[PDB]
Write a protein that binds this ligand. Sequence first.
Ligand code: TNK
Lengths: 534, 404
Amino acid sequence: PISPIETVPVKLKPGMDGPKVKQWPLTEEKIKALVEICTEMEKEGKISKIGPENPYNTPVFAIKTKWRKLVDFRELNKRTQDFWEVQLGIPHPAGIKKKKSVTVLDVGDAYFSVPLDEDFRKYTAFTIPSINNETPGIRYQYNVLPQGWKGSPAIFQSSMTKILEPFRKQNPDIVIYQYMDDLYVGSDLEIGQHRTKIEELRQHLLRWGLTTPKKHQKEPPFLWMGYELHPDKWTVQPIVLPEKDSWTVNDIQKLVGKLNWASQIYPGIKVRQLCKLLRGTKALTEVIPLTEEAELELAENREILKEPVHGVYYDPSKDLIAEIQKQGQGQWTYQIYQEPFKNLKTGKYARMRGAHTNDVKQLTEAVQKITTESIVIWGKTPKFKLPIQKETWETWWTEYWQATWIPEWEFVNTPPLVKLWYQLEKEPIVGAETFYVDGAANRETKLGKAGYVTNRGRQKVVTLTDTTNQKTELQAIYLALQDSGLEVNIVTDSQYALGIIQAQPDQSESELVNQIIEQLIKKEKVYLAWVPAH
Amino acid sequence: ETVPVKLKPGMDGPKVKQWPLTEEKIKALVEICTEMEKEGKISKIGPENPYNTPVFAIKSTKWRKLVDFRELNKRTQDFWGIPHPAGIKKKKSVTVLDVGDAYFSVPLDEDFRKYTAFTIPSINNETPGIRYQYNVLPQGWKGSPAIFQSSMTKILEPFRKQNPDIVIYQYMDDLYVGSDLEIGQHRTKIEELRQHLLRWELHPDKWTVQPIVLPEKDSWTVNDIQKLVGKLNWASQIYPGIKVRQLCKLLRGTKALTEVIPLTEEAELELAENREILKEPVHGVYYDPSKDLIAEIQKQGQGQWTYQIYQEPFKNLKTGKYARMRGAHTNDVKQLTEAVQKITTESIVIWGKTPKFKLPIQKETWETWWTEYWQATWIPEWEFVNTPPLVKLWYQLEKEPIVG
Ligand SMILES: CC(C)c1c(Cc2ccccc2)n(COCc2ccccc2)c(=O)[nH]c1=O
């Protein structure tokens, strides 16, 4: 039961030749078994006993309960041309339009149901051995897409598609999802109509040799990468954290891994304390005792996970809404829903430990990943519900050195709120002290000095052992903020300060900058002035 | 017939991935494509074809199909089009025509079509992408205008002669037509060309490299001088004749930023000498065809954008400013695009090539929406940057009309 389909023209990579790999030696028990299968497949029309002069060959193997064949094309594959990326962007439950009914169709050995470019077959040659390296074994090659070959998936896919164009056009109110060896067929028809269109589909498929199988017949919920697909909602498949009185490094990493993936779907899962255990480790098998705190947090998670979250499917006639919350500095949580409390999706964006950012910025970046995410999933942009005053937004964006933007949104008061922690004054502060900062450091000796001189005669100089040029410059600034009142004027020749101005960051990597930000945030008024040096 | 179009030596085809598209945009491309499919312009392709090029839709209620052949074009063999008529730039008014439609006629060398493969996405990936490749000349591919050359001149002469007072410049899918007639007489001479074509408002000389003008004031404060002195410093990179000694000398000491300072006659002269230097562009800046043309934009704020086209640093071939358009009030991305497009058409008009842009925006941000407001048939090259504080302070300091 093959196929009357037009083959696809497959070529080997630029110049490269077909595989010429030597056939791994096998036992009589295994050889006798492989002969069996190949005689069966030989019959079905799948493979072909071929004559000599097929310099190409691949190592066939026999594994197990009955002997199963298994050819290794690794080489044929690395010599096989490239194809278009087989669908490698898998959907997401939240983007599926619910249908009254869904049927899964098993098009399993459909791989063997599709013809191979007769012109390319020769490369698929392989050999079944004799009892010893005795006489010449049995020789074959595939007449169809071989399991494990570089192009099978793609070609099979393509074909299936060609084959389904008719039926789809005919009944458009019917959605078919070709995923791997499965055809998810769903509709809004009556269970009877449905059942019949399926059967029609089925028959149209056999009409092309795609023998579709009850024992195997799949049923709901449907399993899909940690998701259970029920008719009204989808759900996150059980996630389990194995208990032990012993934990190796690897174990704590894997765990952390899994726990990390859960942070998305599950609210406040945490790993700070588990992650804390990987310090100074010497080997993956090494055993680290879990602290009290880690024991306490590993516990709570087990409880958060023991509370499975479901989700709704997509209704095209209803609004797309996205609410965003700040769960910590540079850390965010979001959920996309149509009806209040019926989420389509949720997620969280880890803390990009950047060199220097501000919340309005990071908030802005979160909105973007989301928007892109939605476009991809729903092909639309949500209505945003953000925890930022329209004024703060206008005030920030209206001045930032970098193009930016947020699609249609609305303010929502679900604290904490995002804000500008400080705003450098636009003009020098009158009657406020003016500090003239400067810092010098022998980049070589890392020996530096940093200080200031105010209009009011106040001065200071601190020595710095093991410092760099920027560390002093920014230091000169820190001190000025430290020793000054609630309003300062600070002039510097640090091109680096010039950065702090244009960006007015509220979080950084260097504790030094961080400190400065603290003083900055505290003062009532600060005026930063850069001036060329020398 | 068709001429053998090969890729440049040792170059493989484009394999650019299609970035996500909005539903609307997708529904359109499907329609636009099914159509063309029938009319034989494009044909569905198999998986044996690994090449791919980005495509999308722009705006009537009708949508245009915009394909991004930047990468293919880069890899497509050279053809040594039409040289740049140094005259198109000096014309009271220039109007552009979309003639991409022209190519739909001519067939494309079959051995090259593969490379034209492109893909229409599917929402959520509930469907495979719909693969196609071209059978005819594609709008957007540099090879198209080049190949449709013999045939363009032909259909062209008659109006070139009927009107030798007007000049025509073809770039990619575009036709830049320039004259001097009065508006009506111009716009009316256009349609005369239109219909001529159908059977098969730029004002260039108004552009100019605006100057920088330093602030002048009754009284100057420490801060003020520091700022002036700061901007001058930077500017010296462009005008070595600029000097700030007698100015920095007024800042000798640690006084309040707010305190007022009386300029010395020395400092006063010094300023005067600088204003003069800034009265005109730096001498010696000429265009070099063999070099890349660059365009840097800065977000001056309040809907203001400064740009500079150049090939070598501090040697501008032109400088300008752009204010947001009525309606873009809350959208940077929109202004930037328009800006870019505008700076790009200008560029083409003067040297016949698109510049490489240094955009003060985040890749992600840009790539998401830019398509939403784009409107040209071509697409320039771009990279994303982090504007130097001074470069902005410097050009913010340009000169505008007394009144408007
Ligand atoms: C792709 C199609 C066929 C489809 C499906 C399956 C489906 C969706 C994503 C991934 C794998 C399978 N579902 C999932 O709903 C599962 C369900 C529906 C009806 C009865 C029980 C379970 C749905 O609600 N609407 C649809 O249109």
